[PDB]
Design an enzyme around this catalytic site. Structure first.
Site, mmCIF file in Angstrom:
data_model
loop_
_atom_site.group_PDB
_atom_site.id
_atom_site.type_symbol
_atom_site.label_atom_id
_atom_site.label_comp_id
_atom_site.label_asym_id
_atom_site.label_seq_id
_atom_site.Cartn_x
_atom_site.Cartn_y
_atom_site.Cartn_z
ATOM 1 N N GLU C 450 -1.438 -44.892 48.900
ATOM 2 C CA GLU C 450 -1.267 -43.834 49.880
ATOM 3 C C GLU C 450 -2.914 -43.390 50.143
ATOM 4 O O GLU C 450 -3.026 -42.268 50.730
ATOM 5 C CB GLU C 450 -0.768 -42.513 48.927
ATOM 6 C CG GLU C 450 0.747 -42.620 48.637
ATOM 7 C CD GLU C 450 1.505 -41.478 48.301
ATOM 8 O OE1 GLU C 450 0.640 -40.480 47.742
ATOM 9 O OE2 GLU C 450 2.374 -41.345 48.499
ATOM 10 N N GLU C 594 1.609 -38.742 34.282
ATOM 11 C CA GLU C 594 1.658 -39.553 35.417
ATOM 12 C C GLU C 594 0.502 -40.601 35.640
ATOM 13 O O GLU C 594 0.611 -41.750 35.998
ATOM 14 C CB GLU C 594 1.494 -38.525 36.677
ATOM 15 C CG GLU C 594 1.581 -39.211 38.085
ATOM 16 C CD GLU C 594 1.225 -38.273 39.353
ATOM 17 O OE1 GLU C 594 0.940 -37.014 38.969
ATOM 18 O OE2 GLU C 594 1.655 -38.552 40.426
HETATM 19 O O1 LIG Z 1 5.594 -39.613 41.829
HETATM 20 C C1 LIG Z 1 5.684 -39.134 43.262
HETATM 21 C C2 LIG Z 1 4.717 -39.363 44.441
HETATM 22 N N1 LIG Z 1 3.296 -39.214 43.847
HETATM 23 C C3 LIG Z 1 2.116 -39.923 44.446
HETATM 24 C C4 LIG Z 1 2.406 -41.384 44.456
HETATM 25 O O2 LIG Z 1 1.464 -42.120 45.268
HETATM 26 C C5 LIG Z 1 3.473 -41.925 45.101
HETATM 27 O O3 LIG Z 1 3.855 -43.257 45.461
HETATM 28 C C6 LIG Z 1 4.871 -41.021 44.529
HETATM 29 O O4 LIG Z 1 5.989 -41.361 44.961
#
Ligand SMILES: OC[C@H]1NC[C@H](O)[C@@H](O)[C@@H]1O
Ligand SMILES: OC[C@H]1NC[C@H](O)[C@@H](O)[C@@H]1O
Ligand SMILES: OC[C@H]1NC[C@H](O)[C@@H](O)[C@@H]1O
EC number: 3.2.1.216
Lengths: 659, 659, 659
Positions: C450, C594
């Site tokens: 991302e 996370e």
């Molecule tokens: O965990 C939710 C979302 N957070 C950010 C991550 O980059 C993405 O891949 C993910 O789907």
């Protein structure tokens, strides 16, 4: 007052009067003892939090027919009229009043919930003069205290040919959940130029009225009609405009066309009829029963009757097994398309039953004990029936299979019956528990005998589970689909026990308790799980005296009657027939209350019961397990010379019985 | 001003100006005479109670393009510019204005309702300087008085690469029924570090604005764009966030990508085209008609055009038979997938039609005269068409069968066509009355000639019922389903009468009255019930004189034209072709009003009519009853050397016609 | 603290405590360090605008178990208790606290989110006193500040057998979108006559409470339970009555029946298990992973987990590809019926995906990046992922095909899989652009990495489009339906490029940037587009050091582990296994955050990842492209003596692995 088509009352006594209903399956209107007034109006399909139970309820609606009549500026009242009479013509659902005012004029007024137009009502007024007189006529739209945030409107709809004056109100049910519109107009014979000017007054917060004067010469008949349309947001997106539109349409159709259409529809309803020779009171009573069922249902819909139909707020307008087991079987035989509406009500709420099942820890579809708009549970929380009386799921499945048996409609079985039967079977498969002996138990229910709470292996409940599972398996075979083999294995091993005396035990805690209503006896009829005649008899002997005289609903004696008819015992059959409704009647029109000496008519459930005692009992008519209708041995009351039953089954057969 | 692709106006006259529309089937933008302003913006699918008719209506929406431009702090106005021109490029729905400001700069601005992005708009502005100058640019979001409870927002969406400033407004339609969101941004070429800082002012209750300044040197071109997204709760659950999301998306796609996608979509639309040689005015006019239909419809939706498309509030945005009979046939031939959207609109409202039928005492599906969001009747209550003009049900069925004939899509016939055809046939079966000679009558309608109210056996209505019943029966055979044999028996015996002069009688009360529009003539085309040429001619001769010049809609002469073309009468065909729209035109862009000398453009119904006169009339193209498209004898206007029609049918055929 | 079934904590440190969750797929309860309190309660399926992101969110709910306990009118506090311990039993989701009050009594309390009853909770409290003493017990219903317009109720539900006192609250989510009802009762063993009187106080606007006193004699254990039902308008039309009804039902079921049903359901869940010999910490950790997945999903529903399941408000409760790609694959192998719920979530939101596609200018179904109640896009607008991260559509399709592969359910393929696959394929067909060399590009996306925004030909995205198209074509063949041949032609020519060193290029702008998470490596697993071992290895070599230590989510290293296991490299496989979660742990229960050193547990996405590393990596288990489950070569960590995996596939196979 024993006309076989008309119920009549002389000089209504307001201190001892229970109104009759006219209805078209959508709107019901309950009579007042007062002339040119109605007691209560009820619109099907409209529910909101209101009064009893803290759950959804039918709402008292606009008493849209209320009129005030004055002669020479003297208001007509019960106290200054004479020869006052009321009559209900069951042939066409016409309620008529008639009286004399002093030396001036005879007034006759008839009102109708129009059979073809679900949301339209009409009252026709005739005045016959004996002397010159001037009438003032006022139509009042009083917003009932059940509704809120009302608006009162009046306008003239015109073209070169008409002036249609519209008295309209719009208001809300208590929580804002439904918007109600009512629009009324007066119809005259004399045409636009000569019709009375219509005045509008809005003197009160909760009432407005339209009015007019008319001079009538001695020896003349002056006629006028009131048309009214009553509709809600539950039926149409924009009830305000739709109500106006409907009344304008009805006005331009005119009295004559409306009543012709009305009569055609009622005539079709009465092509299925029960005729008794040798007992005028029986004949009239059974006509009243048929009439109320026909008035409280509607073909080609998804509506289902409450236990009190459209006679009032009885049981909050909620739908119970009262439909499937009590009102549905007689309608299935006489008019399948009415039965089709009743089960359509359930089919459309299958999803909310699935929801309920999941919330209560179960698979498939768990129908609610009490149902209303959504299909979700609506039982008041203070009644343990809501959580615990589970036979309703099986009752819905029995109805669904019966519908198929009678019509043979395999397309409907695939589209609607099978969805219901499959889900409900899946419920029971998840509901039972297997014990150490390989039997299946259904534990912790409220029994059909609702006085027995939180008990195990209720005879009726366990009977409905057996049928539900068997019928779902048969349904699968008809459609060529494989059904879980567990359904049959479970069905065959669900526990139904006997006490030492060989009598079917009502439940695991049951010895000799008084019971609210038929339960174990229901295994004989309608379930037909017990077919051995000596077993039927023993269960009858043991339980028939277990229902007390007081506070017991009319969901017992009719079955006793039917079962004694099947056993060929005329004296017993007739004793129980009469006992099922005659002690429940209310004056002046012999409406049926829920319990003996009760005062909460009209209990349409009771009617449906007795109707089965007549059709399935005395008539011997029965839904054959292999399809269609058959006839078994039966007996008539001694004093009945002939019983004739018309329009039975899809072949519309006539059955005649004599001694 | 007779370019075959561009409509153009020099120096707009604000005292006599009727704006043109750009649209993508979802949003329409209507031009103002004033530079850098728009008159009106309309969003399809959004309806609430508003003004005319007391019924649901399109709502005037945010004029989201409104911009103010100033040079050296001197506002640009009509009064201080020169060489002002406007042009509509029908090739790509680009509306362009251009002018000179004094000695400083030439301005050109073009706006688009982006064809691929239903909720997105863009205006591109170019400024070419002749001297050094500083512009102040302001984009205004004024909340129209049609909306309420507005909120005005502004924020910066950033990352290391961009600063996307969002001017956002959120508001409600009059009754709170819809929430509207609009979000705008400015796009620059110069990138984040060099782009103008954007200021935000909120000085008024009903308006806020974003603004910036930019110094431009002599001999330079400075470009910027405005992107806007306009959406509602009728389209998306969360319009506020969705509008911002869309404008951010469009901004990061950029001007160049958006316009490339836009042009690809328009290019596909114009692969179906009509070319005329020898008459520049005809060519431009027919292009305008095509362009307006293409702009006012959208493939892959459930949207249907109002009679005025997205040109404004005309007829409250409601859907009428104007779609099925007038706009739908030309779209079906040119672009079936647009027709598919039109009928999808009806399929999804089949349920509300069923409801209407039941409320009016009928079986099946009764489509409303005027339709909007729900599918319920929306005709104002003061107009008797609502209750009484019933041919619309048959019009919907005809459209549905036509769709199948042209595409051959039997999957769609089973899933969508048959539901419609079956329910609508059930309506007609319940609507007719049998008389003593075994004929079937349809009594008490308003005729297609709407000046005939509450009459019996309207020729057009009775024609639609015949077709509806026949087509439903044919549809049943195609799908191998058994259809009620009543449908055929009824169809064959529905009454169509002639007067003594041999002319088709419009209705049972008809002698020689003036008529609003074509009715009896419609039995020839489109219904093709009358194929005898002498009969067509006699009906033409008799009724063509019956339409007054004033207040008669453009739903007549186009049919006259088509029928004279079919008879091979060029002079007559051409007279009626021109008469159908030329007397209805409004300057400066030759937009079509509903009636002769009318002032309520753009009447897309009229366009669809004339387009059939061209395609089915002059082109001789016809929907074959056995499937697909065929060609019958036809004639061209004398002065037309060649007529070329492209992209017809699913085989996308070209038809060429010469003398 | 390395029991393989229990997580345990002595003397909770509130300055460094991250609570554990018990959950039933519908309600989650997160522990407090304080005795007889809970930190947070979360109800699945309930969304409203609240805090983060300006978009819909799970809402903090009633902490319905909060209790205060006093001895001789002296409250329990950290400062006067002793051997305070907490434990989570993963076998049955029971959270237990236990402690001593001075030298006088031992208290144990266990609470449960009941597995069979989605809306019901229970806490069982046992108190053993070593001297005569009186307890005061108080149950508090504090309305959280997330809710508004609260009402606090109390009543007694009775019959001759029971007195069930109900403490009920009703309140609204911030915008009024959801109505929430909570109803609690106390369960006693001693029966109606002897049970404590229950007092009710309402001293605060946002809190009311029920309380009682009880004498306990020396050497006695006094037991009682609290039952709570928590439900909303998102689950049922009338949550107020339904909550009361549920608590009454649960109370009359009784503690013992409820816990029996609870245990049966948990025991079924644990018939699919992972057993490791030779590494107690691994065993407990993998059990915690399984436990959290089982707790945060629910068979026979349409529910899908958020990245943080029911552990709190993590990612606003939204559903992402985190389900389809990360949580779904391990659940599909172990319990297909859980996977069936996950994809059902998407099937039921297919329509809102179609809507999104049309709004963004595409065909078919475009699933949102972030999904919630409606199926519409819910990504906060400030994240460009919402508009631009498009691989989620492919991810949904891959999951759907996988479901079919594993179950072989061709009925489900026709009813649900094919709708999804067809629409999603149609999306991609409309999403690609053909270039001059006849290759297909997907331009202007945000990558799975991302950190790469608005780039072209992202390897992962392009990979999902290839799979989506291929699988849809295969699905067509299975069902005997014709699929556009364009799908294959496109699939075969979608661009996936290599850098000069032969490494898969992440995107067209990619050289050597750090990346957020696995992208190009995902083409190896899960997509299996890259099967050449040297290619896998080179991609691993190039990208594995491209993920920074900080602020990178746990959606990388577990894939690295699985891929090294597939290559048969135990030391690498084990390094990456541990690296995927051990640096992300939080005390005292080893919950997973996370990111490394993160403080936002419980990241259920991460757990699902690692679980694939274990099952698909070390276990070698793989979804065969031709159907069912297969096993490929694999290696174990050196220190693992045995790995056993049970209940795999529809044949419920056991896989055993040793060195
Ligand atoms: O965990 C939710 C979302 N957070 C950010 C991550 O980059 C993405 O891949 C993910 O789907
Ligand atoms: O009439 C509704 C309801 N009343 C109470 C009765 O016991 C039950 O059988 C019936 O369903
Ligand atoms: O254009 C809308 C409506 N206007 C009135 C016309 O007479 C009718 O044909 C048409 O449907």
């Amino acid at each position: 007052h024993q006309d076989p088509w008309k119920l009549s009352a002389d000089k209504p006594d307001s201190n001892n009067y229970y109104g009759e209903t006219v209805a078209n399956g959508m709107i019901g209107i309950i009579s007042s003892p007062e002339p040119l007034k109605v007691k209560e109006v009820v619109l099907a399909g409209t529910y909101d939090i209101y009064k009893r139970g803290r759950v959804s309820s039918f709402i008292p609606n606009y008493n849209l027919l209320n009129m005030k009549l004055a002669f020479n500026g003297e208001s007509v009242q019960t106290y200054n009229i004479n020869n006052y009479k009321q009559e209900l013509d069951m042939r066409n659902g016409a309620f008529t009043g008639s009286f004399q005012f002093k030396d001036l004029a005879t007034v006759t007024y008839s009102y109708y919930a129009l059979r073809h137009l679900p949301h339209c009502i009409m009252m026709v007024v005739n005045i016959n003069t004996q002397k010159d007189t001037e009438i003032n006529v006022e139509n009042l739209l009083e917003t009932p205290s059940s509704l809120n945030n009302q608006q009162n409107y009046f306008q003239n709809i015109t073209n070169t040919h008409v002036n249609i004056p519209l008295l309209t109100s719009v208001a809300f049910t208590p929580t804002g959940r439904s918007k109600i519109a009512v629009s009324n107009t007066f119809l005259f014979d004399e045409g636009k130029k000569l019709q009375p000017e219509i005045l509008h007054r809005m003197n009160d917060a909760d009432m407005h009225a339209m009015s007019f004067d008319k001079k009538i010469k001695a020896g003349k008949t002056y006629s006028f009609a009131l048309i009214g349309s009553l509709i809600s947001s539950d039926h149409i997106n924009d009830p305000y405009n739709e109500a106006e539109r409907l009344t304008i349409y009805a006005a331009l159709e005119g009295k004559s066309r409306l009543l012709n259409r009305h009569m055609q529809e009622w005539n079709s309803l009465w092509q299925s009829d029960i005729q008794v020779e040798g007992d005028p009171q029986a004949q009239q009573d059974i006509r009243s029963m048929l009439y109320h069922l026909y008035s409280f249902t509607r073909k080609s819909t998804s509506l289902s009757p409450s236990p009190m139909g459209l006679s009032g707020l009885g049981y909050n307008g909620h739908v119970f097994w009262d439909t499937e087991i009590w009102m549905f079987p007689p309608m299935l035989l006489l008019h399948p398309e009415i039965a089709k509406s009743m089960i359509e009500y359930r089919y459309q709420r299958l999803d909310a039953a699935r929801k309920k099942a999941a919330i209560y820890g179960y698979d498939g579809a768990m129908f609610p004990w009490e149902s209303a708009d959504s299909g979700a549970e609506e039982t008041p929380v203070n009644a343990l029936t809501g959580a615990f009386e589970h036979h309703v799921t099986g009752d819905v499945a029995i109805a669904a299979w019966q519908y198929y048996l009678v019509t043979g409609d395999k397309e409907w079985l695939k589209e609607k019956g099978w969805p219901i039967l499959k889900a409900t079977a899946e419920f029971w498969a998840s509901r039972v528990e297997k014990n150490d002996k390989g039997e299946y138990e259904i534990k912790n229910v409220v029994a059909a005998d609702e006085w027995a709470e939180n008990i195990d292996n209720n005879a009726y409940t366990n009977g409905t589970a057996i049928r539900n599972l068997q019928y779902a398996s048969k349904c699968a075979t008809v459609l060529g689909v494989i059904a879980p083999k567990e359904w049959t294995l479970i069905a065959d091993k669900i526990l139904i026990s006997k006490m030492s005396n060989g009598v079917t035990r009502e439940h695991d805690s049951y010895t000799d308790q008084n019971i609210k209503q038929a339960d174990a006896n229901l295994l004989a009829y309608p379930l037909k799980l017990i077919t051995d005649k000596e077993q039927i008899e023993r269960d009858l002997k043991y339980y028939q005296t277990k229902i007390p005289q007081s506070d017991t609903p009319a969901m017992t004696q009719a079955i006793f009657s039917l079962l004694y008819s099947r056993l060929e015992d005329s004296d017993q059959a007739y004793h129980w027939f009469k006992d099922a409704y005659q002690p429940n009647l209310n004056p002046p029109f012999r409406v049926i209350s829920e319990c003996k000496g009760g005062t909460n008519p009209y209990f349409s459930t009771g009617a449906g019961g007795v109707l089965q005692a007549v059709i399935m009992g005395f008539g011997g008519l029965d839904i054959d397990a292999a399809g269609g209708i058959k006839q078994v041995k039966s007996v008539l009351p001694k004093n009945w010379k002939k019983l004739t039953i018309t329009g039975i089954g899809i072949e519309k057969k006539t059955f005649v019985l004599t001694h």
